[PDB]
Structure formats: structure tokens, C-alpha cells
């Protein structure tokens with residue numbers, strides 16, 4: 001239901017599907033080891049290119065430290081533990097004009113579902 005514009009650019013647009021756990025110790029902070037589950041489809045074809053659920057291996061990364069796509073950094077730094085969102089990430093905040101191999105053509109709108117499982121205070 002809740003539609004959040006995450007960039008003034010409109011590039012990252014998040015829809016909350018399940019409100020996260022309320023409180024402070026539940027919202028992750030910059031540089032923390034984030035653990036997420038996600039599904040990535042291409043807006044064009046609705047084809048899944050990646051599913052952490054389907055591989056049963058959650059994705060861990062350090063928030064806002066440039067490890068993942070910019071759409072992901074922005075998106076994840078706006079979530080609560082146990083939040084599920086939909087994020088429409090525009091190619092600029094994704095893989096840009098190059099794209100990324102076969103799965104993802106140049107200039108591709110990305111649709112993720114992202115669940116924030118947990119986070120440690122790591123590096």
C-alpha cells in the first residue's frame with residue numbers, strides 16, 4: 001500500500017508490503033552488515049533474473065558502502081527489520097547503459113522485492 005519516493009529523481013520508488021518491526025534498535029544504520037532476501041525481475045518482461053529465496057541463501061552486505069547497486073543502498077537504508085517492500089529501481093540506480101550480462105539488457109528498469117531479515121554492526 002504505502003508508496004515512497006526515495007529519490008527526488010524518482011529513480012527509486014518503494015512500496016511497503018509489510019511494515020517492519022517498530023522501535024529504534026530495529027532500523028539499520030550506515031555501514032552495518034545487512035542481510036536481505038530478494039527477488040529481482042525486469043520490468044519489461046516480468047522475468048525473474050535472480051532470487052535469493054529460490055537459492056535459499058540470504059544476501060549479506062555492508063550498507064551504503066558501495067557494494068551493491070545504488071537503488072539497493074538507497075532502498076535498504078530506509079527499511080525496518082522484517083519490512084517487505086517492492087522497489088522499482090531505474091537503470092541509472094541499477095546497471096545503467098551497460099546492463100549486466102545476459103539476464104539484464106542495457107537500460108533496464110529493475111523490480112525487486114526485498115525483505116530485510118536482520119543486521120549486525122560489522123565493518
Ligand SMILES: CCc1ccccc1NC(=O)CSc1nc2cccnc2[nH]1
Pocket residue numbers: 040049050067068069072100101103104
Ligand atoms: C553480480 C551481481 C552482484 C555482485 C556483487 C554485489 C552485488 C550484486 N548484485 C546486486 O547488487 C543486486 S542483485 C543482482 N544483480 C544481478 C545481475 C545479474 C544477475 N543477477 C543479479 N542479481
